[PDB]
Design a protein around this motif. Structure first.
Motif, PDB file in Angstrom:
ATOM      1  N   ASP A  49       0.801  -1.220   0.000  1.00 30.55           N
ATOM      2  CA  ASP A  49       0.000   0.000   0.000  1.00 30.55           C
ATOM      3  C   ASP A  49       0.828   1.261   0.000  1.00 30.55           C
ATOM      4  N   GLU A  50       2.024   1.147   0.580  1.00 30.11           N
ATOM      5  CA  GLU A  50       2.901   2.319   0.671  1.00 30.11           C
ATOM      6  C   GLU A  50       3.346   2.750  -0.719  1.00 30.11           C
ATOM      7  N   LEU A  51       3.768   1.741  -1.464  1.00 26.77           N
ATOM      8  CA  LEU A  51       4.226   1.921  -2.851  1.00 26.77           C
ATOM      9  C   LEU A  51       3.100   2.443  -3.726  1.00 26.77           C
ATOM     10  N   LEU A  52       2.040   1.649  -3.854  1.00 20.78           N
ATOM     11  CA  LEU A  52       0.877   1.981  -4.669  1.00 20.78           C
ATOM     12  C   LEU A  52       0.365   3.368  -4.428  1.00 20.78           C
ATOM     13  N   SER A  53       0.456   3.801  -3.156  1.00 20.64           N
ATOM     14  CA  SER A  53      -0.039   5.128  -2.801  1.00 20.64           C
ATOM     15  C   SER A  53       0.834   6.213  -3.423  1.00 20.64           C
ATOM     16  N   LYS A  54       2.103   5.901  -3.671  1.00 19.43           N
ATOM     17  CA  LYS A  54       3.019   6.888  -4.234  1.00 19.43           C
ATOM     18  C   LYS A  54       2.901   7.034  -5.745  1.00 19.43           C
ATOM     19  N   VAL A  55       2.424   5.991  -6.418  1.00 16.72           N
ATOM     20  CA  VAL A  55       2.272   5.997  -7.863  1.00 16.72           C
ATOM     21  C   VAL A  55       1.571   7.195  -8.458  1.00 16.72           C
ATOM     22  N   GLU A  56       2.203   7.890  -9.393  1.00 20.00           N
ATOM     23  CA  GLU A  56       1.670   9.026 -10.104  1.00 20.00           C
ATOM     24  C   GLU A  56       1.529   8.716 -11.609  1.00 20.00           C
ATOM     25  N   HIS A  57       2.048   7.559 -12.010  1.00 19.81           N
ATOM     26  CA  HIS A  57       1.965   7.208 -13.439  1.00 19.81           C
ATOM     27  C   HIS A  57       2.089   5.710 -13.528  1.00 19.81           C
ATOM     28  N   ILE A  58       1.402   5.132 -14.529  1.00 20.96           N
ATOM     29  CA  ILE A  58       1.519   3.682 -14.700  1.00 20.96           C
ATOM     30  C   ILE A  58       2.004   3.438 -16.153  1.00 20.96           C
ATOM     31  N   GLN A  59       2.945   2.539 -16.286  1.00 16.68           N
ATOM     32  CA  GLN A  59       3.500   2.175 -17.574  1.00 16.68           C
ATOM     33  C   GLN A  59       3.231   0.693 -17.742  1.00 16.68           C
ATOM     34  N   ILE A  60       2.560   0.308 -18.832  1.00 14.61           N
ATOM     35  CA  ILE A  60       2.346  -1.136 -18.999  1.00 14.61           C
ATOM     36  C   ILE A  60       3.146  -1.600 -20.206  1.00 14.61           C
ATOM     37  N   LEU A  61       3.727  -2.776 -20.118  1.00 12.66           N
ATOM     38  CA  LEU A  61       4.429  -3.363 -21.234  1.00 12.66           C
ATOM     39  C   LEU A  61       3.888  -4.763 -21.496  1.00 12.66           C
ATOM     40  N   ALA A  62       3.731  -5.132 -22.765  1.00 10.74           N
ATOM     41  CA  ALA A  62       3.281  -6.498 -23.026  1.00 10.74           C
ATOM     42  C   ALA A  62       3.321  -6.760 -24.546  1.00 10.74           C
ATOM     43  N   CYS A  63       3.065  -7.991 -24.914  1.00 13.90           N
ATOM     44  CA  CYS A  63       3.015  -8.324 -26.336  1.00 13.90           C
ATOM     45  C   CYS A  63       1.711  -9.054 -26.683  1.00 13.90           C
ATOM     46  N   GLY A  64       1.346  -9.089 -27.956  1.00 16.78           N
ATOM     47  CA  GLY A  64       0.223  -9.874 -28.412  1.00 16.78           C
ATOM     48  C   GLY A  64      -1.100  -9.540 -27.715  1.00 16.78           C
ATOM     49  N   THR A  65      -1.772 -10.605 -27.299  1.00 16.70           N
ATOM     50  CA  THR A  65      -3.108 -10.411 -26.666  1.00 16.70           C
ATOM     51  C   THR A  65      -2.944  -9.664 -25.358  1.00 16.70           C
ATOM     52  N   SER A  66      -1.818  -9.862 -24.651  1.00 13.68           N
ATOM     53  CA  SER A  66      -1.560  -9.161 -23.407  1.00 13.68           C
ATOM     54  C   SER A  66      -1.467  -7.681 -23.587  1.00 13.68           C
ATOM     55  N   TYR A  67      -1.102  -7.159 -24.735  1.00 16.15           N
ATOM     56  CA  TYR A  67      -1.054  -5.733 -24.980  1.00 16.15           C
ATOM     57  C   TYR A  67      -2.482  -5.205 -25.090  1.00 16.15           C
ATOM     58  N   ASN A  68      -3.350  -6.054 -25.674  1.00 15.25           N
ATOM     59  CA  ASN A  68      -4.763  -5.665 -25.879  1.00 15.25           C
ATOM     60  C   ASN A  68      -5.433  -5.436 -24.506  1.00 15.25           C
ATOM     61  N   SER A  69      -5.180  -6.317 -23.548  1.00 18.46           N
ATOM     62  CA  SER A  69      -5.738  -6.106 -22.191  1.00 18.46           C
ATOM     63  C   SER A  69      -5.173  -4.869 -21.526  1.00 18.46           C
ATOM     64  N   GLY A  70      -3.862  -4.653 -21.624  1.00 16.39           N
ATOM     65  CA  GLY A  70      -3.275  -3.438 -21.060  1.00 16.39           C
ATOM     66  C   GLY A  70      -3.910  -2.230 -21.681  1.00 16.39           C
ATOM     67  N   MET A  71      -4.204  -2.266 -22.985  1.00 15.99           N
ATOM     68  CA  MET A  71      -4.823  -1.098 -23.622  1.00 15.99           C
ATOM     69  C   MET A  71      -6.235  -0.796 -23.067  1.00 15.99           C
ATOM     70  N   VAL A  72      -6.969  -1.835 -22.696  1.00 16.51           N
ATOM     71  CA  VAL A  72      -8.310  -1.628 -22.151  1.00 16.51           C
ATOM     72  C   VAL A  72      -8.132  -0.876 -20.810  1.00 16.51           C
ATOM     73  N   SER A  73      -7.282  -1.460 -19.999  1.00 12.80           N
ATOM     74  CA  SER A  73      -6.959  -0.940 -18.674  1.00 12.80           C
ATOM     75  C   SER A  73      -6.523   0.487 -18.679  1.00 12.80           C
ATOM     76  N   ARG A  74      -5.851   0.984 -19.693  1.00 10.77           N
ATOM     77  CA  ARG A  74      -5.485   2.391 -19.761  1.00 10.77           C
ATOM     78  C   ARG A  74      -6.723   3.269 -19.716  1.00 10.77           C
ATOM     79  N   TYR A  75      -7.837   2.846 -20.343  1.00  5.00           N
ATOM     80  CA  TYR A  75      -9.033   3.718 -20.302  1.00  5.00           C
ATOM     81  C   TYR A  75      -9.578   3.822 -18.860  1.00  5.00           C
ATOM     82  N   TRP A  76      -9.561   2.720 -18.153  1.00  2.00           N
ATOM     83  CA  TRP A  76      -9.997   2.515 -16.803  1.00  2.00           C
ATOM     84  C   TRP A  76      -9.124   3.317 -15.831  1.00  2.00           C
ATOM     85  N   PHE A  77      -7.806   3.136 -15.901  1.00  2.00           N
ATOM     86  CA  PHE A  77      -6.920   3.885 -15.024  1.00  2.00           C
ATOM     87  C   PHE A  77      -7.118   5.363 -15.212  1.00  2.00           C
TER      88      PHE A  77
END
Ligand SMILES: O=P(O)(O)OC[C@H]1O[C@H](O)[C@H](O)[C@@H](O)[C@@H]1O
Ligand SMILES: O=P(O)(O)OC[C@H]1O[C@H](O)[C@H](O)[C@@H](O)[C@@H]1O
Lengths: 366, 366
Positions: free
Chosen positions: B44-72
């Motif tokens: 919780d200490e870490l997560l609370s400090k987060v000001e930006h999220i960077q996702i990396l992935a390939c293939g279908t995993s990139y597609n899920s990260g892209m959905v999540s960007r709208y949500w975040f």
């Protein structure tokens, strides 16, 4: 407004690139350094505060913004995000601290781009900068700052000189900011030298026209094409695929070169030629191995590469050698062969180059 | 590890989605709130400090990260960037202040993803979080934090339950952060309710299987397809086009719905059906007008829409009505029909569903 000796305005506009770039450079280069003292006197104050850049645009203008993102992060060290204007305007975005908003538009009247601009005013952007080719257009009028590309009127429905001049102007902006952030002055000097060489690198590329005309014959009867690129050339693969879609009506799609194995490799056959835009040796090695896997289906790889890499054609790998060019302007240089490839495929098929079916110069309405 | 009554592991894996999602939810929902107290106490200490999220992935995993960007960005108000792992690892990026690095991977062994993780260690990320389906895999081992999706072994080469369970886990992470940033607790509660409804919304969608089987007949002899989506559904159009490429070998391409007029409209004919994923009335209005322009070439629009929107089929516009679903989990729900469409087209053509040509479960080598 007139073709002269050219068959189409789009052909005329491709050939005008050396000169359009010369005109965009005129007055912004003073003493081996970028001179953007047209933005006004307060300009430097704002730019110096920028901690993030957000670009919005549509169509070919998005492709140029995407190139520029590689440049802004690696050369000026500033975080950059590029977004399709229609996507930005319909979602709830997180505003970034001290974000500068840049809009890219040939016409300056594109409805989704204007809409994103306006919304941005209500969201807390430090300010807005418009890069456009039409003086006094809406985007120009409502933006805080504006840098005109000065490429002259573009009549062809598909953009050519407006794209190359937008990349030139973004490269000038990357130089100026690397300076205001106090980075090695080498960075600005390399960019300025590259820019000074640009106009004749392009006249150099226009002289290979007959070689591109010959390559077009191989693509003229195909129904699909895959364009691959890595890094600053990935967006150039995007523009290349877009041009084949626009004036030749071929289902060309662009893909990041590293993702070939994650999907599209299962599609490759004789009817889907693969084009790679300026790969390095390590990337070529990987792609050669992938194309080998689809040799039984007739997959062919066409590579636009620097003569100096010393690549040699194989049976299913065709190297299309190009003159060596400065790394910083490479993405602009490699656009030309792809504009000419689409143009020659269209000429062979006899498609309406200047007014391709179902497309318009600017989508000013929602 | 076994098919049971199913013809293919991929079919089995699609049908297992309700249950895989139930297992990923188990223990993370405690009192109408997300419980991620498995990440450890310091978490919780870490997560609370987060000001930006960077996702990396390939293939279908990139597609899920892209959905999540709208949500975040819209739900937790935190800036998010998603990047193809191969692109990230070959460029010089600008690190963001207090950026958290998230990697998404079914296998946890994907070479480009691992490479980006490692590079990130040298770049100044606040920390790393791995979302993966294989316990004790490299990505899991080298990340600071790890959330397993718990979907069970996925044998089909194309990912199904691993994608839907990754979206579930990202949605839990969006809830937790909206809380740590002290946003209305309504946000977390809506997400939790949506998640609680999820498993049976999907069992609900699996019951329309025969309707999807019938639609597959229309696509079985086509050589192209265009998938369109806006916002959180754009990445779902990406995954839908990817699945048609993967197991049916059709040249399906996804495009942001607002960009249809900027290029691809010139391609549409009877051999390129257009699929739109859950449009609202305003978007449908625009797309209907675009498809009308290509009616002479036989362009057809297929729309997956909520029954409650009250859309009616026309001659070149086919509404495929779906049960109403909570907005927050809509992107996960609409994935199912697109997985089943690709599966049924593959069954008709008789293609190797579990081991599609030239593709592999994880690309562990460079
Ligand atoms: O650059 P803009 O004027 O904003 O227009 C964006 C796009 O609009 C139309 O689709 C044109 O045909 C494209 O060439 C252009 O890229
Ligand atoms: O999610 P990962 O294990 O990182 O793998 C990324 C991709 O790799 C392979 O291409 C698989 O066929 C895909 O289904 C998968 O999305």
């Amino acid at each position: 407004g007139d073709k002269g000796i050219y068959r189409h305005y789009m052909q005329k506009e491709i050939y005008e690139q050396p000169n359009a770039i010369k005109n965009t450079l005129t007055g912004r280069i003073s003493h081996g350094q970028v001179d953007l003292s047209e933005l006004g006197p307060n300009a430097d104050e704002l730019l110096s505060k920028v901690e993030h850049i957000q670009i919005l645009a549509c169509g070919t203008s998005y492709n140029s913004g995407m190139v520029s993102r590689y440049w802004f992060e690696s050369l000026a060290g500033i975080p950059c995000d590029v977004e399709i204007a229609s996507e930005f305007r319909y979602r709830k975005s997180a505003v970034r601290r001290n974000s500068l908003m840049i809009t890219l538009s040939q016409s300056g009247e594109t409805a989704d781009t204007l809409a994103g601009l306006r919304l941005s005013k209500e969201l807390g952007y430090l300010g807005s900068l418009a890069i456009c080719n039409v003086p006094g257009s809406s985007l120009v009028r409502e933006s805080d700052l504006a840098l005109m590309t000065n490429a002259g009127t573009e009549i062809g429905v598909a953009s050519t000189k407006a794209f190359t001049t937008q990349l030139t102007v973004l490269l000038m902006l990357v130089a100026k900011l690397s300076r205001l952030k106090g980075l090695d002055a080498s960075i600005e000097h390399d960019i300025v030298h590259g820019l000074q060489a640009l106009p004749s690198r392009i006249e150099q590329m226009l002289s290979q026209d007959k070689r591109i005309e010959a390559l077009a014959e191989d693509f003229s009867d195909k129904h699909h094409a895959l364009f691959l690129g890595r890094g600053d050339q990935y967006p150039i693969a995007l523009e290349g695929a877009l041009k084949l879609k626009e004036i030749s009506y071929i289902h060309a799609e662009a893909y990041a070169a590293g993702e070939l194995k994650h999907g599209p490799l299962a599609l490759i056959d004789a009817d889907m030629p693969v084009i790679v835009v300026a790969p390095n040796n390590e990337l070529l090695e990987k792609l050669k191995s992938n194309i080998e896997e689809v040799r039984a289906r007739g997959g062919q790889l066409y590579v636009f590469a620097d003569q100096d890499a010393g690549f040699v054609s194989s049976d299913n790998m065709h190297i299309i050698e190009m003159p060596h060019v400065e790394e910083v302007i490479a993405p602009i240089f490699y656009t030309v062969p792809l504009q000419l490839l689409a143009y020659h495929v269209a000429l062979i098929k006899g498609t309406d180059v200047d007014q391709p079916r179902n497309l318009a110069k600017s989508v000013t309405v929602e």
